[PDB]
PDB file of all heavy atoms in Angstrom:
ATOM      1  N   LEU A   1    -106.503 -17.414 -12.436  1.00  0.00           N
ATOM      2  CA  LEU A   1    -107.239 -17.021 -13.613  1.00  0.00           C
ATOM      3  C   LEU A   1    -108.657 -17.549 -13.580  1.00  0.00           C
ATOM      4  O   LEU A   1    -109.528 -16.833 -14.089  1.00  0.00           O
ATOM      5  CB  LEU A   1    -106.540 -17.511 -14.882  1.00  0.00           C
ATOM      6  CG  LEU A   1    -105.295 -16.813 -15.288  1.00  0.00           C
ATOM      7  CD1 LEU A   1    -104.662 -17.575 -16.420  1.00  0.00           C
ATOM      8  CD2 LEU A   1    -105.579 -15.430 -15.794  1.00  0.00           C
ATOM      9  N   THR A   2    -108.896 -18.744 -13.004  1.00  0.00           N
ATOM     10  CA  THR A   2    -110.211 -19.297 -13.080  1.00  0.00           C
ATOM     11  C   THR A   2    -110.376 -20.364 -11.919  1.00  0.00           C
ATOM     12  O   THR A   2    -109.485 -20.535 -11.144  1.00  0.00           O
ATOM     13  CB  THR A   2    -110.444 -20.021 -14.455  1.00  0.00           C
ATOM     14  OG1 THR A   2    -111.800 -20.318 -14.622  1.00  0.00           O
ATOM     15  CG2 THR A   2    -109.607 -21.292 -14.613  1.00  0.00           C
ATOM     16  N   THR A   3    -111.493 -20.955 -11.905  1.00  0.00           N
ATOM     17  CA  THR A   3    -111.828 -21.987 -10.970  1.00  0.00           C
ATOM     18  C   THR A   3    -112.323 -23.242 -11.628  1.00  0.00           C
ATOM     19  O   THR A   3    -112.665 -23.186 -12.835  1.00  0.00           O
ATOM     20  CB  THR A   3    -112.965 -21.528 -10.061  1.00  0.00           C
ATOM     21  OG1 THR A   3    -114.176 -21.379 -10.802  1.00  0.00           O
ATOM     22  CG2 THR A   3    -112.608 -20.219  -9.346  1.00  0.00           C
ATOM     23  N   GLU A   4    -112.317 -24.329 -10.834  1.00  0.00           N
ATOM     24  CA  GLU A   4    -112.708 -25.580 -11.406  1.00  0.00           C
ATOM     25  C   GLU A   4    -114.168 -25.573 -11.963  1.00  0.00           C
ATOM     26  O   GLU A   4    -114.397 -26.091 -12.984  1.00  0.00           O
ATOM     27  CB  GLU A   4    -112.537 -26.743 -10.443  1.00  0.00           C
ATOM     28  CG  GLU A   4    -112.861 -28.080 -11.090  1.00  0.00           C
ATOM     29  CD  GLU A   4    -112.559 -29.263 -10.150  1.00  0.00           C
ATOM     30  OE1 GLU A   4    -111.433 -29.258  -9.508  1.00  0.00           O
ATOM     31  OE2 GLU A   4    -113.360 -30.195 -10.093  1.00  0.00           O
ATOM     32  N   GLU A   5    -114.996 -24.826 -11.279  1.00  0.00           N
ATOM     33  CA  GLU A   5    -116.389 -24.777 -11.711  1.00  0.00           C
ATOM     34  C   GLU A   5    -116.586 -23.975 -12.951  1.00  0.00           C
ATOM     35  O   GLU A   5    -117.436 -24.415 -13.751  1.00  0.00           O
ATOM     36  CB  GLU A   5    -117.282 -24.224 -10.574  1.00  0.00           C
ATOM     37  CG  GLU A   5    -118.855 -24.136 -10.946  1.00  0.00           C
ATOM     38  CD  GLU A   5    -119.671 -25.463 -10.759  1.00  0.00           C
ATOM     39  OE1 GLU A   5    -119.214 -26.346 -10.033  1.00  0.00           O
ATOM     40  OE2 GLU A   5    -120.831 -25.529 -11.304  1.00  0.00           O
ATOM     41  N   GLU A   6    -115.901 -22.884 -13.147  1.00  0.00           N
ATOM     42  CA  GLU A   6    -116.042 -22.074 -14.349  1.00  0.00           C
ATOM     43  C   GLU A   6    -115.282 -22.602 -15.599  1.00  0.00           C
ATOM     44  O   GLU A   6    -115.665 -22.341 -16.775  1.00  0.00           O
ATOM     45  CB  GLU A   6    -115.468 -20.699 -13.951  1.00  0.00           C
ATOM     46  CG  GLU A   6    -115.496 -19.688 -15.022  1.00  0.00           C
ATOM     47  CD  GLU A   6    -114.828 -18.381 -14.557  1.00  0.00           C
ATOM     48  OE1 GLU A   6    -113.544 -18.257 -14.465  1.00  0.00           O
ATOM     49  OE2 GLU A   6    -115.568 -17.369 -14.304  1.00  0.00           O
ATOM     50  N   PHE A   7    -114.210 -23.420 -15.352  1.00  0.00           N
ATOM     51  CA  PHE A   7    -113.358 -23.961 -16.333  1.00  0.00           C
ATOM     52  C   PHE A   7    -113.977 -25.150 -16.981  1.00  0.00           C
ATOM     53  O   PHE A   7    -113.461 -26.310 -16.757  1.00  0.00           O
ATOM     54  CB  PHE A   7    -112.007 -24.157 -15.727  1.00  0.00           C
ATOM     55  CG  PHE A   7    -110.904 -24.401 -16.790  1.00  0.00           C
ATOM     56  CD1 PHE A   7    -110.767 -23.662 -17.942  1.00  0.00           C
ATOM     57  CD2 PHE A   7    -109.875 -25.329 -16.461  1.00  0.00           C
ATOM     58  CE1 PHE A   7    -109.710 -23.844 -18.897  1.00  0.00           C
ATOM     59  CE2 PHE A   7    -108.836 -25.533 -17.444  1.00  0.00           C
ATOM     60  CZ  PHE A   7    -108.775 -24.802 -18.535  1.00  0.00           C
ATOM     61  N   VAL A   8    -114.948 -25.025 -17.834  1.00  0.00           N
ATOM     62  CA  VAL A   8    -115.718 -26.130 -18.412  1.00  0.00           C
ATOM     63  C   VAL A   8    -114.996 -26.577 -19.664  1.00  0.00           C
ATOM     64  O   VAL A   8    -114.045 -25.911 -20.205  1.00  0.00           O
ATOM     65  CB  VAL A   8    -117.143 -25.689 -18.732  1.00  0.00           C
ATOM     66  CG1 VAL A   8    -117.907 -25.412 -17.364  1.00  0.00           C
ATOM     67  CG2 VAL A   8    -117.188 -24.542 -19.650  1.00  0.00           C
ATOM     68  N   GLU A   9    -115.465 -27.691 -20.212  1.00  0.00           N
ATOM     69  CA  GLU A   9    -115.001 -28.189 -21.509  1.00  0.00           C
ATOM     70  C   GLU A   9    -115.054 -27.069 -22.513  1.00  0.00           C
ATOM     71  O   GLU A   9    -116.001 -26.309 -22.568  1.00  0.00           O
ATOM     72  CB  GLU A   9    -115.837 -29.279 -22.099  1.00  0.00           C
ATOM     73  CG  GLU A   9    -115.697 -30.661 -21.649  1.00  0.00           C
ATOM     74  CD  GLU A   9    -116.636 -31.542 -22.495  1.00  0.00           C
ATOM     75  OE1 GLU A   9    -116.307 -31.748 -23.724  1.00  0.00           O
ATOM     76  OE2 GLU A   9    -117.711 -31.831 -22.055  1.00  0.00           O
ATOM     77  N   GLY A  10    -114.017 -26.965 -23.336  1.00  0.00           N
ATOM     78  CA  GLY A  10    -114.068 -26.056 -24.413  1.00  0.00           C
ATOM     79  C   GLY A  10    -112.694 -25.917 -25.131  1.00  0.00           C
ATOM     80  O   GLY A  10    -111.737 -26.592 -24.834  1.00  0.00           O
ATOM     81  N   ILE A  11    -112.672 -25.048 -26.167  1.00  0.00           N
ATOM     82  CA  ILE A  11    -111.427 -24.645 -26.845  1.00  0.00           C
ATOM     83  C   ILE A  11    -111.083 -23.288 -26.292  1.00  0.00           C
ATOM     84  O   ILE A  11    -111.921 -22.384 -26.184  1.00  0.00           O
ATOM     85  CB  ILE A  11    -111.621 -24.650 -28.376  1.00  0.00           C
ATOM     86  CG1 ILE A  11    -112.076 -26.010 -28.901  1.00  0.00           C
ATOM     87  CG2 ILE A  11    -110.314 -24.208 -29.063  1.00  0.00           C
ATOM     88  CD1 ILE A  11    -112.395 -26.128 -30.232  1.00  0.00           C
ATOM     89  N   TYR A  12    -109.817 -23.275 -25.752  1.00  0.00           N
ATOM     90  CA  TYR A  12    -109.357 -22.047 -25.149  1.00  0.00           C
ATOM     91  C   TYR A  12    -108.164 -21.517 -25.904  1.00  0.00           C
ATOM     92  O   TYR A  12    -107.393 -22.234 -26.527  1.00  0.00           O
ATOM     93  CB  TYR A  12    -108.950 -22.291 -23.669  1.00  0.00           C
ATOM     94  CG  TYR A  12    -110.084 -22.588 -22.819  1.00  0.00           C
ATOM     95  CD1 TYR A  12    -110.696 -23.834 -22.839  1.00  0.00           C
ATOM     96  CD2 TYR A  12    -110.728 -21.584 -22.072  1.00  0.00           C
ATOM     97  CE1 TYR A  12    -111.824 -24.145 -21.989  1.00  0.00           C
ATOM     98  CE2 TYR A  12    -111.851 -21.862 -21.207  1.00  0.00           C
ATOM     99  CZ  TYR A  12    -112.322 -23.137 -21.189  1.00  0.00           C
ATOM    100  OH  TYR A  12    -113.461 -23.312 -20.406  1.00  0.00           O
ATOM    101  N   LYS A  13    -107.962 -20.169 -25.774  1.00  0.00           N
ATOM    102  CA  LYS A  13    -106.800 -19.520 -26.348  1.00  0.00           C
ATOM    103  C   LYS A  13    -106.185 -18.645 -25.334  1.00  0.00           C
ATOM    104  O   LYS A  13    -106.799 -17.764 -24.746  1.00  0.00           O
ATOM    105  CB  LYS A  13    -107.232 -18.590 -27.561  1.00  0.00           C
ATOM    106  CG  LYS A  13    -106.046 -17.725 -28.071  1.00  0.00           C
ATOM    107  CD  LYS A  13    -106.182 -17.206 -29.494  1.00  0.00           C
ATOM    108  CE  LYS A  13    -107.255 -16.123 -29.511  1.00  0.00           C
ATOM    109  NZ  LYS A  13    -107.222 -15.482 -30.898  1.00  0.00           N
ATOM    110  N   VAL A  14    -104.889 -18.867 -25.105  1.00  0.00           N
ATOM    111  CA  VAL A  14    -104.006 -18.097 -24.231  1.00  0.00           C
ATOM    112  C   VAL A  14    -103.142 -17.255 -25.111  1.00  0.00           C
ATOM    113  O   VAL A  14    -102.292 -17.683 -25.861  1.00  0.00           O
ATOM    114  CB  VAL A  14    -103.168 -18.972 -23.254  1.00  0.00           C
ATOM    115  CG1 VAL A  14    -102.248 -18.128 -22.412  1.00  0.00           C
ATOM    116  CG2 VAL A  14    -104.117 -19.842 -22.380  1.00  0.00           C
ATOM    117  N   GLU A  15    -103.346 -15.959 -24.928  1.00  0.00           N
ATOM    118  CA  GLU A  15    -102.520 -14.935 -25.693  1.00  0.00           C
ATOM    119  C   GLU A  15    -101.582 -14.198 -24.764  1.00  0.00           C
ATOM    120  O   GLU A  15    -101.995 -13.644 -23.736  1.00  0.00           O
ATOM    121  CB  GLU A  15    -103.459 -13.985 -26.449  1.00  0.00           C
ATOM    122  CG  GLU A  15    -102.867 -12.854 -27.057  1.00  0.00           C
ATOM    123  CD  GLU A  15    -103.880 -12.016 -27.750  1.00  0.00           C
ATOM    124  OE1 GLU A  15    -104.408 -12.372 -28.798  1.00  0.00           O
ATOM    125  OE2 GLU A  15    -104.099 -10.887 -27.248  1.00  0.00           O
ATOM    126  N   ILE A  16    -100.300 -14.270 -25.060  1.00  0.00           N
ATOM    127  CA  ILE A  16     -99.252 -13.658 -24.242  1.00  0.00           C
ATOM    128  C   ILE A  16     -98.694 -12.441 -25.015  1.00  0.00           C
ATOM    129  O   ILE A  16     -98.263 -12.570 -26.096  1.00  0.00           O
ATOM    130  CB  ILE A  16     -98.073 -14.711 -23.885  1.00  0.00           C
ATOM    131  CG1 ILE A  16     -98.804 -15.958 -23.288  1.00  0.00           C
ATOM    132  CG2 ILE A  16     -97.066 -14.126 -22.889  1.00  0.00           C
ATOM    133  CD1 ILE A  16     -97.888 -16.966 -22.929  1.00  0.00           C
ATOM    134  N   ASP A  17     -98.721 -11.273 -24.352  1.00  0.00           N
ATOM    135  CA  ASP A  17     -98.240 -10.084 -25.055  1.00  0.00           C
ATOM    136  C   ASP A  17     -96.718  -9.854 -24.951  1.00  0.00           C
ATOM    137  O   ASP A  17     -96.200  -9.088 -24.206  1.00  0.00           O
ATOM    138  CB  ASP A  17     -98.937  -8.807 -24.527  1.00  0.00           C
ATOM    139  CG  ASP A  17     -98.461  -7.521 -25.319  1.00  0.00           C
ATOM    140  OD1 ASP A  17     -97.824  -7.657 -26.360  1.00  0.00           O
ATOM    141  OD2 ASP A  17     -98.783  -6.406 -24.804  1.00  0.00           O
ATOM    142  N   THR A  18     -96.085 -10.632 -25.804  1.00  0.00           N
ATOM    143  CA  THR A  18     -94.526 -10.688 -25.842  1.00  0.00           C
ATOM    144  C   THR A  18     -93.986  -9.358 -26.389  1.00  0.00           C
ATOM    145  O   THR A  18     -92.970  -8.916 -25.970  1.00  0.00           O
ATOM    146  CB  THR A  18     -94.134 -11.890 -26.611  1.00  0.00           C
ATOM    147  OG1 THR A  18     -94.664 -11.856 -27.924  1.00  0.00           O
ATOM    148  CG2 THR A  18     -94.500 -13.157 -25.920  1.00  0.00           C
ATOM    149  N   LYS A  19     -94.735  -8.717 -27.291  1.00  0.00           N
ATOM    150  CA  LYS A  19     -94.141  -7.592 -28.070  1.00  0.00           C
ATOM    151  C   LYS A  19     -93.967  -6.377 -27.007  1.00  0.00           C
ATOM    152  O   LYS A  19     -92.875  -5.775 -26.972  1.00  0.00           O
ATOM    153  CB  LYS A  19     -95.144  -7.169 -29.146  1.00  0.00           C
ATOM    154  CG  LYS A  19     -94.581  -6.066 -30.018  1.00  0.00           C
ATOM    155  CD  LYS A  19     -95.505  -5.672 -31.150  1.00  0.00           C
ATOM    156  CE  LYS A  19     -94.856  -4.997 -32.284  1.00  0.00           C
ATOM    157  NZ  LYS A  19     -95.794  -4.245 -33.074  1.00  0.00           N
ATOM    158  N   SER A  20     -94.960  -6.133 -26.218  1.00  0.00           N
ATOM    159  CA  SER A  20     -94.871  -5.059 -25.205  1.00  0.00           C
ATOM    160  C   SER A  20     -93.749  -5.320 -24.242  1.00  0.00           C
ATOM    161  O   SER A  20     -93.055  -4.397 -23.799  1.00  0.00           O
ATOM    162  CB  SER A  20     -96.177  -4.847 -24.406  1.00  0.00           C
ATOM    163  OG  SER A  20     -97.205  -4.425 -25.302  1.00  0.00           O
ATOM    164  N   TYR A  21     -93.603  -6.613 -23.841  1.00  0.00           N
ATOM    165  CA  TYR A  21     -92.558  -7.010 -22.958  1.00  0.00           C
ATOM    166  C   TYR A  21     -91.107  -6.613 -23.478  1.00  0.00           C
ATOM    167  O   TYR A  21     -90.325  -5.955 -22.837  1.00  0.00           O
ATOM    168  CB  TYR A  21     -92.571  -8.503 -22.703  1.00  0.00           C
ATOM    169  CG  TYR A  21     -91.445  -9.004 -21.804  1.00  0.00           C
ATOM    170  CD1 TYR A  21     -91.424  -8.774 -20.460  1.00  0.00           C
ATOM    171  CD2 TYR A  21     -90.302  -9.686 -22.370  1.00  0.00           C
ATOM    172  CE1 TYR A  21     -90.391  -9.232 -19.646  1.00  0.00           C
ATOM    173  CE2 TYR A  21     -89.241 -10.134 -21.544  1.00  0.00           C
ATOM    174  CZ  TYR A  21     -89.374  -9.889 -20.137  1.00  0.00           C
ATOM    175  OH  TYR A  21     -88.393 -10.283 -19.223  1.00  0.00           O
ATOM    176  N   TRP A  22     -90.801  -7.051 -24.810  1.00  0.00           N
ATOM    177  CA  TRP A  22     -89.524  -6.759 -25.348  1.00  0.00           C
ATOM    178  C   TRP A  22     -89.356  -5.260 -25.655  1.00  0.00           C
ATOM    179  O   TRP A  22     -88.221  -4.758 -25.473  1.00  0.00           O
ATOM    180  CB  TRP A  22     -89.317  -7.564 -26.619  1.00  0.00           C
ATOM    181  CG  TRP A  22     -89.174  -9.000 -26.396  1.00  0.00           C
ATOM    182  CD1 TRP A  22     -89.987 -10.000 -26.839  1.00  0.00           C
ATOM    183  CD2 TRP A  22     -88.177  -9.661 -25.638  1.00  0.00           C
ATOM    184  NE1 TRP A  22     -89.533 -11.178 -26.488  1.00  0.00           N
ATOM    185  CE2 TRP A  22     -88.419 -11.036 -25.661  1.00  0.00           C
ATOM    186  CE3 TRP A  22     -87.063  -9.221 -24.916  1.00  0.00           C
ATOM    187  CZ2 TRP A  22     -87.683 -11.989 -25.044  1.00  0.00           C
ATOM    188  CZ3 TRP A  22     -86.292 -10.153 -24.283  1.00  0.00           C
ATOM    189  CH2 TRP A  22     -86.579 -11.563 -24.351  1.00  0.00           C
ATOM    190  N   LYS A  23     -90.385  -4.597 -26.023  1.00  0.00           N
ATOM    191  CA  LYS A  23     -90.321  -3.153 -26.353  1.00  0.00           C
ATOM    192  C   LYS A  23     -89.852  -2.338 -25.128  1.00  0.00           C
ATOM    193  O   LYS A  23     -89.082  -1.367 -25.257  1.00  0.00           O
ATOM    194  CB  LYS A  23     -91.583  -2.579 -26.888  1.00  0.00           C
ATOM    195  CG  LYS A  23     -91.972  -3.079 -28.365  1.00  0.00           C
ATOM    196  CD  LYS A  23     -91.216  -2.279 -29.356  1.00  0.00           C
ATOM    197  CE  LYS A  23     -92.172  -1.573 -30.444  1.00  0.00           C
ATOM    198  NZ  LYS A  23     -93.352  -0.850 -29.687  1.00  0.00           N
ATOM    199  N   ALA A  24     -90.349  -2.723 -23.978  1.00  0.00           N
ATOM    200  CA  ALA A  24     -90.090  -2.028 -22.708  1.00  0.00           C
ATOM    201  C   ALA A  24     -88.635  -2.262 -22.337  1.00  0.00           C
ATOM    202  O   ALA A  24     -88.092  -1.485 -21.488  1.00  0.00           O
ATOM    203  CB  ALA A  24     -91.045  -2.492 -21.631  1.00  0.00           C
ATOM    204  N   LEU A  25     -88.039  -3.373 -22.811  1.00  0.00           N
ATOM    205  CA  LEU A  25     -86.613  -3.528 -22.647  1.00  0.00           C
ATOM    206  C   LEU A  25     -85.736  -2.925 -23.747  1.00  0.00           C
ATOM    207  O   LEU A  25     -84.465  -3.000 -23.713  1.00  0.00           O
ATOM    208  CB  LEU A  25     -86.354  -5.057 -22.604  1.00  0.00           C
ATOM    209  CG  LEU A  25     -86.873  -5.865 -21.391  1.00  0.00           C
ATOM    210  CD1 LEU A  25     -86.512  -7.390 -21.509  1.00  0.00           C
ATOM    211  CD2 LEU A  25     -86.270  -5.322 -20.070  1.00  0.00           C
ATOM    212  N   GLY A  26     -86.377  -2.271 -24.725  1.00  0.00           N
ATOM    213  CA  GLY A  26     -85.614  -1.610 -25.810  1.00  0.00           C
ATOM    214  C   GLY A  26     -85.311  -2.475 -27.013  1.00  0.00           C
ATOM    215  O   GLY A  26     -84.495  -2.098 -27.909  1.00  0.00           O
ATOM    216  N   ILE A  27     -85.966  -3.718 -27.092  1.00  0.00           N
ATOM    217  CA  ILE A  27     -85.692  -4.613 -28.148  1.00  0.00           C
ATOM    218  C   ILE A  27     -86.910  -4.670 -29.014  1.00  0.00           C
ATOM    219  O   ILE A  27     -87.978  -4.702 -28.551  1.00  0.00           O
ATOM    220  CB  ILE A  27     -85.458  -6.048 -27.531  1.00  0.00           C
ATOM    221  CG1 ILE A  27     -84.051  -6.038 -26.797  1.00  0.00           C
ATOM    222  CG2 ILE A  27     -85.458  -7.083 -28.635  1.00  0.00           C
ATOM    223  CD1 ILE A  27     -84.032  -7.020 -25.552  1.00  0.00           C
ATOM    224  N   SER A  28     -86.654  -4.653 -30.321  1.00  0.00           N
ATOM    225  CA  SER A  28     -87.772  -4.681 -31.282  1.00  0.00           C
ATOM    226  C   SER A  28     -87.888  -6.152 -31.624  1.00  0.00           C
ATOM    227  O   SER A  28     -87.038  -6.697 -32.337  1.00  0.00           O
ATOM    228  CB  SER A  28     -87.492  -3.825 -32.488  1.00  0.00           C
ATOM    229  OG  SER A  28     -88.545  -3.798 -33.383  1.00  0.00           O
ATOM    230  N   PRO A  29     -88.938  -6.833 -31.229  1.00  0.00           N
ATOM    231  CA  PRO A  29     -89.037  -8.299 -31.446  1.00  0.00           C
ATOM    232  C   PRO A  29     -89.831  -8.646 -32.681  1.00  0.00           C
ATOM    233  O   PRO A  29     -90.388  -7.711 -33.315  1.00  0.00           O
ATOM    234  CB  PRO A  29     -89.789  -8.787 -30.267  1.00  0.00           C
ATOM    235  CG  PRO A  29     -90.858  -7.730 -30.083  1.00  0.00           C
ATOM    236  CD  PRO A  29     -90.108  -6.395 -30.443  1.00  0.00           C
ATOM    237  N   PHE A  30     -89.803  -9.880 -33.100  1.00  0.00           N
ATOM    238  CA  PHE A  30     -90.397 -10.413 -34.316  1.00  0.00           C
ATOM    239  C   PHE A  30     -91.937 -10.562 -34.186  1.00  0.00           C
ATOM    240  O   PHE A  30     -92.712 -10.089 -35.014  1.00  0.00           O
ATOM    241  CB  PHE A  30     -89.826 -11.644 -34.811  1.00  0.00           C
ATOM    242  CG  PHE A  30     -90.367 -12.152 -36.071  1.00  0.00           C
ATOM    243  CD1 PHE A  30     -90.007 -11.552 -37.238  1.00  0.00           C
ATOM    244  CD2 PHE A  30     -91.159 -13.267 -36.103  1.00  0.00           C
ATOM    245  CE1 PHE A  30     -90.475 -12.060 -38.470  1.00  0.00           C
ATOM    246  CE2 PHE A  30     -91.658 -13.711 -37.343  1.00  0.00           C
ATOM    247  CZ  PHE A  30     -91.343 -13.171 -38.476  1.00  0.00           C
ATOM    248  N   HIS A  31     -92.288 -11.242 -33.123  1.00  0.00           N
ATOM    249  CA  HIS A  31     -93.737 -11.666 -33.009  1.00  0.00           C
ATOM    250  C   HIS A  31     -94.640 -10.608 -32.462  1.00  0.00           C
ATOM    251  O   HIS A  31     -94.217  -9.800 -31.559  1.00  0.00           O
ATOM    252  CB  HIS A  31     -93.905 -12.960 -32.228  1.00  0.00           C
ATOM    253  CG  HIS A  31     -93.033 -14.050 -32.741  1.00  0.00           C
ATOM    254  ND1 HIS A  31     -91.796 -14.297 -32.302  1.00  0.00           N
ATOM    255  CD2 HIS A  31     -93.282 -14.897 -33.722  1.00  0.00           C
ATOM    256  CE1 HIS A  31     -91.316 -15.277 -32.965  1.00  0.00           C
ATOM    257  NE2 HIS A  31     -92.179 -15.722 -33.802  1.00  0.00           N
ATOM    258  N   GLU A  32     -95.906 -10.547 -32.823  1.00  0.00           N
ATOM    259  CA  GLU A  32     -96.868  -9.594 -32.294  1.00  0.00           C
ATOM    260  C   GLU A  32     -97.256 -10.097 -30.846  1.00  0.00           C
ATOM    261  O   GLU A  32     -97.521  -9.313 -29.947  1.00  0.00           O
ATOM    262  CB  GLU A  32     -98.130  -9.463 -33.130  1.00  0.00           C
ATOM    263  CG  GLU A  32     -97.895  -8.747 -34.406  1.00  0.00           C
ATOM    264  CD  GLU A  32     -97.461  -7.305 -34.155  1.00  0.00           C
ATOM    265  OE1 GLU A  32     -98.274  -6.556 -33.562  1.00  0.00           O
ATOM    266  OE2 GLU A  32     -96.355  -6.930 -34.502  1.00  0.00           O
ATOM    267  N   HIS A  33     -97.379 -11.351 -30.694  1.00  0.00           N
ATOM    268  CA  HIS A  33     -97.729 -12.029 -29.438  1.00  0.00           C
ATOM    269  C   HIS A  33     -97.497 -13.513 -29.620  1.00  0.00           C
ATOM    270  O   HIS A  33     -97.221 -13.938 -30.752  1.00  0.00           O
ATOM    271  CB  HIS A  33     -99.208 -11.729 -29.006  1.00  0.00           C
ATOM    272  CG  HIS A  33    -100.261 -11.901 -30.068  1.00  0.00           C
ATOM    273  ND1 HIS A  33    -100.585 -13.092 -30.609  1.00  0.00           N
ATOM    274  CD2 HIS A  33    -101.066 -10.920 -30.622  1.00  0.00           C
ATOM    275  CE1 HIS A  33    -101.561 -12.927 -31.477  1.00  0.00           C
ATOM    276  NE2 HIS A  33    -101.857 -11.615 -31.582  1.00  0.00           N
ATOM    277  N   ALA A  34     -97.560 -14.246 -28.485  1.00  0.00           N
ATOM    278  CA  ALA A  34     -97.604 -15.719 -28.595  1.00  0.00           C
ATOM    279  C   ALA A  34     -99.067 -16.232 -28.232  1.00  0.00           C
ATOM    280  O   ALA A  34     -99.591 -15.786 -27.273  1.00  0.00           O
ATOM    281  CB  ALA A  34     -96.555 -16.333 -27.653  1.00  0.00           C
TER     282      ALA A  34
END
């Protein structure tokens, strides 16, 4: 995803698209994402 040089101090957000994952398996999940 990144390198040591680019990955500077800061506040980061990792968004995981869980909803698309479950939908593709036929399951209607609760969360929009994690």
Side-chain angles (χ1 to χ4, degrees):
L1 287 170
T2 194
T3 65
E4 184 174 316
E5 179 84 13
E6 177 186 75
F7 194 40
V8 294
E9 280 184 73
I11 299 174
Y12 293 79
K13 173 159 72 171
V14 175
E15 174 179 288
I16 309 180
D17 182 15
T18 55
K19 187 180 201 199
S20 297
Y21 180 76
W22 292 117
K23 288 280 235 48
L25 292 177
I27 291 149
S28 180
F30 184 73
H31 306 93
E32 290 298 298
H33 46 69

